[PDB]
Protein: Monothiol glutaredoxin-5, mitochondrial
Amino acid sequence: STEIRKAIEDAIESAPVVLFMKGTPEFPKCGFSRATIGLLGNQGVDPAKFAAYNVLEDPELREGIKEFSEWPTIPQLYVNKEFIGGCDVITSMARSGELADLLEEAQALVP
Structure:
């Protein structure tokens, strides 16, 4: 819908690093959403350059981001408006070091 597409665009432009997740950073849903929040914390992502949105109680946004990203699972990471991936990709990139490089180059890490 017009509203959902606008919502998604607004969400992804709201910060250099954006996470669609189950729960919130304060109350993250156990499982892959909480793990991914912790992973981003360990990476040193600057909270001032980060935004997260809870799809867990927002069925329209949940379905919307899955269609938009062409990816069916949550959480999903966007950096500078680009889809980076769901959890497997995020975690793999963290392990290999591509995530750190990406976040550094996006100037999204704490000083």
The first strand starts at residue 17 and ends at 21.
